[model samples]
Structure formats: C-alpha cells, structure tokens
Target chain A: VNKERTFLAVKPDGVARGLVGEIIARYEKKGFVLVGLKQLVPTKDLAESHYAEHKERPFFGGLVSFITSGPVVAMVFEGKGVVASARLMIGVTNPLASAPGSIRGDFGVDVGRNIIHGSDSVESANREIALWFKPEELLTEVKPNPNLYE
Target chain B: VNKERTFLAVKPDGVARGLVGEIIARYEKKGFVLVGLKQLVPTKDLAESHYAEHKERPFFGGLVSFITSGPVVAMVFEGKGVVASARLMIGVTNPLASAPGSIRGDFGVDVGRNIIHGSDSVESANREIALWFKPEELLTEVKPNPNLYE
Candidate 1:
C-alpha cells in the first residue's frame, strides 16, 4: 500500500484499436516508470480468479470473457501515488460518463468496453501485478528517480 | 524492400526525460506494430559500431559519447512503409528544424540532442535491428491484422 506501483491492462478492445502505445504514453508522460510490459491473452482461470470478488453479481462473467477474448497488454508502472493517479488518468468505469482528458474519456464509449483497466487501490495493485506477471518478466529498479520524491 | 519493418531508438536524452512511451506511442498511433523492444545501456564497442559509418564525421565522437552515457530504449516496428514513415515521424536531424507534427518537432530542440533515432532506409534498418537485438528478443506475427491492410 505504498502507492508507488500499479497494475494496468490494455484490454482486447484497446489492443484491437491499436491504442496500447497511446495508453502507455499517457502514463509515461505523467512520469511513471515502465516496470513491466508484455502482450498476452489472459487464461480463463486467471481472469476468473481476478474477478472472483465480483463473481456473484453485477458483471463478472463478461469481465472474464472480454479480457480473454484477444491480446492484452499488461504492464506495471511505478512512481509516487501511481495507483490513484492512474485511476484518475483512466477516469470512471463508464467511458461515456467519464470526463474528458482522461484515457476512457478520450477513447472509450461503453461501460462494458473500456479500453484499459487500472488497479483501484495499492493493495489491489500489489495483487494484480503478482497475478499478471512473473518475477522474470518485470524490471527491478536500481533506485527511485531522485526527482520523483525528494 | 518489403515495407514491413524498421528500427528506432529513444536515445539517452529521451530516456532520461521519460519520453520513451511517447515516442513509442507515435508509431502505434500511425498503425505500426511493435515487433521488438528492450532497454539497455550501450557499451562503448556497440556504440562505436552503431556509429561506425559516421565515425569520420565532425560529430562522431560526441555521438558515441552521448549515446553511451545512459540507458536506451530500442525497438523494431512493422507495417506498410514503416521505415520511411518512421523517419517522417522523427522529422529532420535538428529538432528545432523539424515540422510540428513530428516527434522531434513536438519535443526536441537540438541536433546533437534529439529525442529519438529511426532508420532512414530498409537496408539500414535491417542492419540496425541486427546490431541492437538478438533473434530471440524479437516477436513474430502469428497473423497479420486484416484491418491494417484491407
């Protein structure tokens, strides 16, 4: 819960629209370090587990089905308060209801089809990053950027 | 050449300034596919060979020194006319002289300190990609995206 790291995924819909790089660019422009990155299709088990908390109700099945549909660009970014800042960058869940200048606000149109997913909290950020990436697939920083915190 | 591939680099200054994602985003926005990517600090020998043809130039020593000074994010992109298109996206040698719509135009200021490097020809691109990455580090297209060409 240190707030320095977060998990983000460019969903199949985003990848289909070729917005992976654009999404990554927004985080980079905000000074986040690209700690991990790779293109992959999520497995059903992983997707199911990821949405397990919400499985009983509103929209879990669709989350798994949509995420497993095609290539997803999973990445971890690090910086001061990156998890919350990233959520702010992504805007609200429904792209139409999301405000402008944010990723969803700028490129999305439907609640069921947002272009990206960012961790909702630091605890979730830690868990989601662990679930989406292995130790070898990620970068370990030598030191925090001096400019980011002091 | 086949118009399917090209090489590019976010040089030390760009990496230092956190412009890596922004540069990558430009090619993605233009419909190019990322075929290879990794970040590393260049050794003197690699830098010397990368600038070998330019070793006789007035700016040769400085080019080697600067590029070797920090980490570089190198990548290969694939798509129609991507080599030339990447060069067009990078603008001229001098950032100040580059057009506004290009990467250099949008973020750079000096010739010796431009934010990125892109291959000027397919022949050179082949050579550069070989120099910067190993065969295993690059990705192969399982299938081409039909929307890109049709």
Candidate 2:
C-alpha cells in the first residue's frame, strides 16, 4: 500500500497511567509521522457518536461511559502500512491475550481497562480522523524518516 | 522505594526497526526521567563486557556478536520502580512468548533478535549504566510531571 493514515487514542486508563508519551513514541519510532494530536475529555455526544457501530451491542453503554470518563489523548499517524502496522502494534483487544511487546499486552490486564484504541481499517481511520480532528488540526505536509523504508 | 535508575539498550534489530523514539517515549510517559541517551556501534570488548553475566552461557558468543553487529541506542532512565517497570515494558526475553504491548512482543519474533535489553534489578542497573555511559553523559538533575504521581 502507499502512504496511509490511522487514528489512535490513549484511553482514560492509559492517560491516567501516563502512557500518552509512550504511545506516541512508539509510532514516532516506527518511522511514522504524527499528523494530528489533541487531549480532551470527550463529551457524551462525542463518545456516543464515536462508538455508534457498537450501539446495538450490549456493552455499548459501558464503552461510551468509560471513554468519556477522563481526558483522552487522540492522535493520527501517517506512514506506509500504518493502518495494519498500528493494529499489530496495538495487539489484540484483550490485553491478557495480547503479546508482550504490544501496548495493551504489556501494560494492561483487563479488557475494560485496556490502555489504547486504534482504527480497525482504513475506512474506519478516515471516519475516526474526521470525527476527532478539525481540518487545521491535522498536518498537511507530512514527511517520514528516511531510514525507515528502503 | 525512593527514586531509582535503570539502564536499557535498544539492540541492533530494534534500531534497524526504527524503535529508538518509541522505546524512550515509553519511560518518558511512565513518569521516568531520561538521564542518559546516545547511539553507537558497540565494540567487541564493550559488547562482551556488557553481556558479561551471560558470558558463561552457551548463547554468550551469539549475544555479543549480534549486539555488536550494528548501531545500538543506549539510555538510562530514573524513577521509582523503573528497573522492574522497564523490564515489564520490554517484555519477556523471548518475543514469541512476550505479551503484546511490550516492545518485543510487538516487533520481535526471535529470542536472538529481541528488540531491547533492560536491567533486571537496581544492582544490575547500576552496573550496566556505569559500563555503558560516562557519568557526564547522564543527567544530574531530574524533574517529573506533577500529574504523574499523586
């Protein structure tokens, strides 16, 4: 794939645990460029809209409540294969099932308290990016480190 | 425990994978202070010395040779419980078995290519830090974000 972008957010647990820097650093080190970033306590309306796909699910209410519980660090990263790569970096949804080096696998023990969230696909990324960031908030000119790709 | 310090190194594979910023950011987010940082290609002697504890093991030769194979990012972090916490962040020695979210679990696949090394304890941290960094290269003063701790 050509240059791609993905949306990721350090959830309330991750922010409270002070993992915002850690999460950003991982993408930075992977040769991705930070395209957008902001920290805000999401409102109920925002959370409900963001998790709309899960609205029909039984756990949807809890999802929205927890996400809006505290300040969350939302960001967008751009790079080749970033969508898939970011998911790999995020590990499985279940922290205990997540492998050691992935963010959730390393720091989290509970699914409800898993530290971060990433867009599941490019379509989702585009939707999430637009939902969370204003046009001015994302970088228009993005450049990645040369050493990352051959 | 009061504030403690630890030594960590991103091995050749980690750097080749471009994880330097990612690794540093983890500790920085964890409320650990970055006390020392540098990039270098290790000398055979330094590699052997650094891995001295494993010198008697059958895999010692491989460890030293591989560590010296390319550029490495050496760094020191200071904070309470940093030594143990860093190890948790780095994950288990075998990336295959490491949980996701840890450095190794996300990026590495082989034990021989485990992405990073972390001091196992305070004593080991002291020894490793001194061996890898000159005192002047380390920060003499450190201050963490107030929001990090209650």
Candidate 3:
C-alpha cells in the first residue's frame, strides 16, 4: 500500500492564483513524498489525452480549453493509499457541494473552476502518471517520514 | 503593501494526521513565505491567550482544550493581502459548508476538528504573530517567487 502513487495537476485557475506551493504543501504535510513535479501550460493534445475518459462528454472541449489556458503544476505523490487519500483531499468535482479542508472545497465555487485534478484509482494513477511524466522526471527512490504510517 | 503577515496553527487532529507539511506547503505555494514555524505541545496559558477573543463564548473552553490536546504546528506567513487570502484558502470554519479548494474544505469534518487556524485581520495577525513567535524565530526578510504577483 505504501507504494501507491497518484497523479495530480493544479489546473490553470489554481496556478494563476499562485496555489502551486499551497497544493504541494498539502500532500507533503500529509506524509506523502513527492515523486514528480513540473510546471507547464498544457498542450491541447496533452489535455485531450489526459481527459480522454471525458472525450465524449459535452464539456470536454471546454475542459481541454481551460486546462491549457495557463501554466499548470503537475506532480506525483507516493504513499500508502495515496490514490484514495489524494482524491479525498481534492474533494468532489463540484466545489460548492464539497466539504471544508479539501482542495476544491476551500477554493472553488464551480466545477468549471475547481483547481485540481487527481487520478481516480490506482489503475488510473499509473496511467495518468506515465502519460504526464517521463521516467527521468519521477523519483526513482522515495522515503517518507516514518511516523506517518503504522 | 507586501508586508502583510498572518499567524496560523495546525491543530491537534491535523498534527496527528501528519498534515504539518501539507499545511506549510499550501501557504508556500500560494506565494507566501513562511516567516516562522515550529511544533510544540501548547501550554493552556498560551492557548487561552491565543483564543482570547472568544474568552466569553460558551465554546471557548472546548476550543482551548482541543488546541492543547496534542502537538500543534504554529507558523507565520508573509505576503501581500495574506490576511484575507489566507482566510480564503482556509475557507469557513465549518468543514461541511466550506468550498472545495480551501484547507478546511478539503480535510476538515467538524468545526471542533477544523484542521488549521488563521488570523482574521491585520490587527489580529500582528497580535497573534507576536504571541506565538519570538522576534528571532520570525524572518525579517522574505522574497517570494517574482512570477506570483505583478
């Protein structure tokens, strides 16, 4: 379980708000180790591929457009239950309905404006991580604070 | 205008959940610089003074008790509009009602277990910073990423 990893991106709104550090700090404090990190304005191709699962949805075009609108901070965090925990920290897709203390619940008001994207499961985590990061970009070895887990 | 500083603390539940790094990283990513940080089990005296504004409230005793129940991470962050911006990042006190991206919105569940605390105003920031940190513990010089603000 400790080997689990999750891919996350700070969407344009988040990066524009200068929330990159804030977002990174949350996962770090949660005792997850940083496995990969970068900042880039997403390419349309990348955006489309990343959100391929939503390709047929009515909002797909807009989702790709907004993600590419400005710089985004993409990263990977690794730890036990990271996929689930990261999703929990991100809250629901609609910020208005999300509870407090989550990434979106704290900052967002609309689904269109939610500030981050995280892989939904361990399988998606691997796929998303590989799609967005190169072998060189991800950490080869990671060690978390011993006090964080049983 | 860039001299703003705010006082914040990660309460017991946050610490027990190992959210210190996550908490620090949020302010860091938001383009605020950490001026002071430390972890300690609070003295009841310090807790009372810190929450002194609520001294007459019925919930004040519980507030103080929860904060001192375990180790807390006390910190100061500096940046423009940090008081208000930090509050925005923290979201409302009730986790159930906060927006998605806020700290409380993302992680909190109970008002009593709200993970972090932020100073509500410039006056309070100054008073709380002074009360929680010694002059030496706080950095006098802070320079954030130039890209964060114009």
Candidate 4:
C-alpha cells in the first residue's frame, strides 16, 4: 500500500554504537515521514511477544534477551511501499553478507547483530507498530510532502 | 562542563524540509548522547517564552511565528562540552556564510531559516532544556559510552 507505515527499531547494539541518528537520517533522506518515534528499554515480555512468530525457533530466546539488554530507538516511517523499501534500505539480516551502501552493509557485521531491524512486510509492519506503540503515540495526520512524492 | 546537555530544535523549515534525521545524525556521530526527544507543534505562549530574551529584538515576532508554523522536532543531547559543540556543529546564524562540513554550510541557505538551533552556553542549555522539557521527560542517568569517551 502507498503511504504504508513500517516498524523499525534501532537495536541495543545500534543504540550502544550510537547509530540512531544515522539510521533516522537515512529514512528522512529517502523521503519517508516519521510517524512514530521514541527510546525505551524494552521489557522481556514485550520482547518475547515481538518475536512471537519465531518462538518455536532455537534463536528466539537470544533475540529477546539481546533486545532487552539496553535502550532501543523505535520508530515508524510512512511512505509509498515503505515496508519493502525500508527492508531494502536496511540490507540483509547479516551485515557482513549485506552489500555496501545498505545500512547493514555499511555499518553492520555478524548475523543477528544487524544494527537495525525493519518489519518484513506490510502485514508485519502493522502488527509490529501495534505491538510497540500505543495508538496515541503514532501520528494520525501525515501527508507526504508533494516535493517527495507525486 | 563535561556531560553537559543542550537543547536543540529542528526548526519549522528544517522539519518541513525533512532534515530532522540529518541533523540528529551529525550529533550522534560526534559522540553526543540523545537524552530527550519529541515532536510537537509549539503553542504560541511556549514559543513566545522561548524567545523571551529576544522579545525586544527586531526579528522576535518572525522567530516565534516561524517556529510555531509547523511540527518541531525538539531534542536534548548530552556530552562533554556539548553546548558549544552543538553550536559549532549547527554553524553560525547565517547559514550561507557558515564554513563547510557544518550543518548549515552543507544543507541550509537562508539567515532566519537555519535548519537547527542550539543553546549557546552551558547555562542557556540548562534553561532551554527546562523550558522545552519536563524534568521527567529528560534522561537523568546518562553516562557517556566508554567506547566514545575516556
């Protein structure tokens, strides 16, 4: 959907590495409108629920623990096909394997330690946004600047 | 003072032009810690009070009006000598004359519409922070990341 919103969290590593601004800068330059943003220490329950889809997987436990390790910068960006576009900008899950010029490719290394996490699809984007932010926290009135879109 | 905090606002022009992320990215890379952040449309009284020192100045009304024109991205960053450092990073009042590599020199063009504002001194930083944020809105337990500092 055009003007779709995607959930993104600057992981603990990214926050520790102090890449929050750099990550947000990329989306702004890409013409995405930030609809929701904040910084918080995620609770264990929230983390588990966030990765509920992967609960059956062996890596699930580690994912939850790592995210709750420190403060995370969570945000939602709205734009045309933002879900897929944000994913493309974030690069692959493994920063080392990701290409240059992408967020992970340039600043990320290792597998699960990717500096940023983006919702994989529109469906997941909505679900993740709902999970991370209260409806009041998200901007309801957003119009893409004509300068950035047709 | 080390671990000083400065108040910064991506001005209306800056926010409308989508420069919030770029502005934040610069400070993050400079080793500053973001302690407070939010986007809000300023109330007229708040804007008037913020520029109270300049109320007698010729550009006072324009300054207040411009800031209240749109959604402003307000934030506070902490680090050693962050007050002056942020001012330096934002460049001079007239962006056209600012040196290269500075925020204004790179992305700004006009005089009154510089993309960002920075508290000019440690004292002003404290005052500005107080004016724009509630005590609870700020992060009180900030320690510079050892990797980024001594």
Candidate 5:
C-alpha cells in the first residue's frame, strides 16, 4: 500500500500525564512521518462533531465532555495503510484487552483515560485531519541521524 | 499465555544518544512491566557467551566489539508472551526490513548498530536473564496507570 495520512491524538488525560513525548517517540520509531501536529483544547462543538458517529452510543456524552475538558495533542501521521496501522498501534479501546505492545494496551487503564486515539478509517482520517489542522500548520521534514543506530 | 519475562537491552549507541528514556517509554506504553534494570559495561566473557550461538557469523567480532564499547542499559520486561512479543516490538534483526511500527522499522538504520535487543525465545530469555541479572536485582511492582483506563 502507498503511504497515506491518518489522524492521531493524545487525549487530555494523556497530555496531563506527559505522555506526548513517549507517544511521539513510538510513532517515530515505527517509521511513520509526522506531517502535522498541534496542541490545542478542542472546542466543544468540534469534539461533538468529531465523534458524531458515536453520538448514539452510551459513552458519547462522556467522550465529548472529557475531550473538551482540557488540551489535546492532535497529529497527522503518514505511512502505508496509516489508518488501520495506527489503530493497531493504539490497541483496543479498553486497555485491559489491548495487547501489551500497543499504546492503549500499555498506558491506558480505562476507556475514558485511554491515552491515545487514531482515526478508524480513511474517511475518518481525512475528516479528522481537516478538523484538527489549519492549512499552514502542517510540516514535512526528516532530521537525519548519521550514526542513529550506531 | 501467562505473564512471562524477557531480556531487553539498550546498546551503547542508544545510550550514547540519550535514548534510554525513549526506549523505556516504549515498554511502558506496551504494558510491559520493568522488573530489572542497570547500567553496566559487560566483560568480554559475558559478551562472547551472549552471542555464542552466532559466533561463527562474520559480524560476531564487530558485534562484541561494539557492545563492549560502552555501558549498556540492561533490563527485564514482564508481560504475556514477552519473549516473542519483545522480538516483534524490536522488529527484524536487519532494520532495513523492519516494519514501520516495529522499533527497528522506525529508528534503526542498520543491523550493526541496532539500538536495542530482546531475547529471541523463551530459552534465550532464561539464559540471558541469568547472565545479566542477579535474583535480588529485580523488583516487583504494579503499573500506576492500570486503573486510569479501566
């Protein structure tokens, strides 16, 4: 698959825990390119619309409330099959069920505090990308490390 | 599978780059518990035995030389399927082939200087554990974030 971009975010709880660097390091190690990143407290309306698909679900209200409660770190990662690939990296919504190697599996102890989020599909990724980033906000560059692994 | 422990290490290059925090963060996020950790420069004998199975390979000499070059951050990580699981997290031996999400996929640029290592199997895990750590060196603990996502 060709490289595609997906939206990823660290929830407010994740931000509070200072897991932003920890999370970014993982994605960088995983070969994903960081195309866009912005730390902002999502507006109430934005959070609501972002998860509109889940609005009918029982946890929808809680989801929106928590997301808008504090600042969140939104990111756009680019790589092959980035949509599904990022979801796997995020692990199951519930940390208890997520495998140990995933972000959710390791740092998340509850659904509400799931430390990270990834767009579930290409459509969602596109929508989330537009919603979280302004046109001039994204950057594409790689810092070279000559003896990186050495 | 029940919880298992495996040996993982940060090579000299990783430590040189101040990647200990970056590497530890991966395990922390992957739901792996850190049981034992220390900084030590392995004696030549220890390095030889650690790579005994690969001694005949052309790269063994260089491998030993590199490891012996500096102090390494040795650690034991505990989790279900931690042996193979760690290998997966570490990615392919040749970073060139490592997938984007695996550690090698993103950060490792070459095999000789691969920044990290994990036991290849249960047997190796046991052997490596005994070689690198004393019984009392390990500690017992629970993840603080365990309940945060539940």
Candidate 6:
C-alpha cells in the first residue's frame, strides 16, 4: 500500500487566490513525494469527457461549467495509501463543516469554491489518473529529507 | 512598507502536531517573505519576560503554561504591516467565531490551544524578535519565486 498512486488537484479558486504553496506545503510536510504537477486549464472537451459519467446527472452541466471556468493545478501523488490519506487530509466538500485540520477545514469555505479535489477511492483514483495524466507525467521516486522529521 | 518585519510563531500544539509547514505556507502564499525561523522550547524566564506587560493579567499564568508546554516554531515575517497582517491571517483567538478562511478559524478550536501566534503590533514584534532570535538567526534574502502569485 505504500507505493500506491493517487490523483489530487488544486481547484481554480485555490490557484487564483494563491493557495498552491500553502496546499502543497501540507503534502510535502506530511512526507508525501511530489510526482507530477502543473497549472493548466482543461479544455471544455476534456472537462466534458472527464465528467461524462455524470452527463445524466442534474448538476453535470454546472460541474463542467465551473471546473473549466479557470485554470486548475493538476497533479499525481504517490505514497502509501496516498489516495485515501490525501482525501482524509482534504476533508469534506464544505470547508466550513470539514474538520479543522483538513485542507478544506483550513483554507476553504464554500462547497462550490472548495480549495482542492481528490479521488474518493482507488477505483475513482485510477479512472481520474488515467484521464488526467500521461504516462511520462509522473515522477518515479521520492527522496526524503531525514532531518525535517528526526 | 512591504519589507517590514514582525514576529510569528506556531504554538506548542501546532508544533507538536507538525503544523509548521501549514502555517508558514500561508504567509508565503500571501506574498510575504520569511526572514527568520527555528524550532525550540522556550525557557520559563524567556516566556515570562516576553509577556511581562501581561504579568498581572488574569490569564498570564495560563498563557505561560500553555506556551511552554512543548516546542514551538518561531520566525520573523517581513511584509507591509506584517504585524497586523499576521493577525488577520491568524483570525480571532476563538476558533468557533473565527472566519472560515483564516488559520484559527480553519485549524484551531480552543483559545488555550490555538495552533499559532502572531505579533499584535510592531512594538511587540520588535520585543519578540529580540527575545526569540539573535540578530543572525534570521535569514534575509529576496525570494525570486514569482510563481507564488502566478
């Protein structure tokens, strides 16, 4: 489980408001390795396809609209149970109700403008990882700074 | 004014739980620069002297006890009116009433265990800087990380 891969993102609002450093600092501090990262605005086509499964859902249209409204910071994370652990670190959708120590709990407010996004499970993480990253986009190994922790 | 300096610290609970990166990342993301930093447990004499003016306050004993209970991450921040700015970032001391986006509102729950501390004014900042750090303890350099905002 330690070598698993996951997908995480900083949403448009977060990037626009300059929270990337604040957000990334948490994962780094927590000993997660940085793999692939970039600031990009997804094309409407990409967003539409990304949410294609939700095409039949009521909020699907709005979901695509908001996600592509601005640039999003896309990233791939790798570590032990990184998917679930990152989700736990990010907390719930509503920043106000999210646990105080979680990312959403720490720097977010509204559900619509939550500061981050993470796959809910391994299955979702797999699907999203394939959708968002090319094979060469992810870094393979992470070297830890032993001094920070000891 | 953008280059002004002030004192800041992650309290015992914050340091004990490893929130130094989380807190420093906020200031960095907010366009401020770090001038000083270190990890240490304050001596009783230093704590008492730091809060000397409040020595007669009803909550002084509790304040000292809480602050010195464990190690703290102390640093000096430089920016425009950083003393007040740090407080804005920290939010109110009470987490329940703190705004959702600020540090206290996001990560703290108790007044006694508030996760961090910031200088309330330039004067306190000066005194705190002297007490917590030597003249050479601070790192002074311009960060060229333009991507912090972009």
CAPRI band for model 6: incorrect
The docking category that best describes candidate 1 is acceptable
Best by DockQ: 4
Off by over 4 Å in 1: A1-3, A40-65, A131-150, B1-3, B38-65, B130-139, B142-150
Q: Quick one: best lDDT, which candidate?
A: 4
* lDDT per residue (tens digit) for residues B1-150 in model 5: 334789998999888978888878877765567889999998899999888898999988988889999989999988665677677767788989887666777788988878998999889998999999998898755444442432
Q: In candidate 4, which residue ranges exceed 4 Å CA deviation?
A: A56-58, B56-58, B143-148
What is candidate 3's lDDT per residue for A53-139, written digit by digit as tens? 999999999999999886666778889999999999999989998899998988899889899999999999899889888886666
Answer with 5 or 6, whichever has the higher lDDT.
Answer: 5
Candidate 1: lDDT of A94? 89
Docking quality (DockQ) of candidate 2: 0.10
Q: Candidate 1 residues B1-150, lDDT tens each?
A: 324789898998887777877787777777787777666667899898888899998888998999988767788888889988899999999989999999899999988889898988888899999999888666654334666676
Q: DockQ scores for all the models shown? A: 0.35, 0.10, 0.10, 0.56, 0.18, 0.04
User: RMSD, each candidate, Å?
Assistant: 4.0, 10.1, 12.8, 2.3, 8.8, 11.0
Residue lDDT tens for model 5, A24-126: 9988887777888889998889998889999999988888988988889999887777789889888986665666567875665456678888999998898
Ranking by DockQ: 4, 1, 5, 3, 2, 6
- Candidate 4 structure quality by residue, lDDT tens digits, B42-122: 879989988999999999999899998877888999898898889898889899999999999998899988988899988
In model 2 chain B, the worst 10-residue window by lDDT is B104-113
| CA shift of A12, model 3, Å | 0.5
Chain B TM-score, model 2, reads: 0.95
- After TM-score superposition, the amount by which residue B79's alpha carbon in candidate 2 deviates from its true location, in angstroms, is 34
lDDT of 3 by residue, B1-150 (tens): 887999988887876665766776777767786666555567899999999999999999998899888666677888999999999999997998999888889988898889999999999999998998888666665656778778
i-RMS for every candidate (Å) is: 2.9, 6.3, 9.5, 1.6, 5.2, 8.4
- Whole-model alpha-carbon lDDT for candidate 5: 0.81
Off by over 4 Å in 6: A141-150, B1-150
Q: Give lDDT tens digits, candidate 6, residues B1-150.
A: 456688888989998877889889877655467898899898888888877888999988987888888898899987554677578678887977887767888888888888988888898898999999998888767562332222
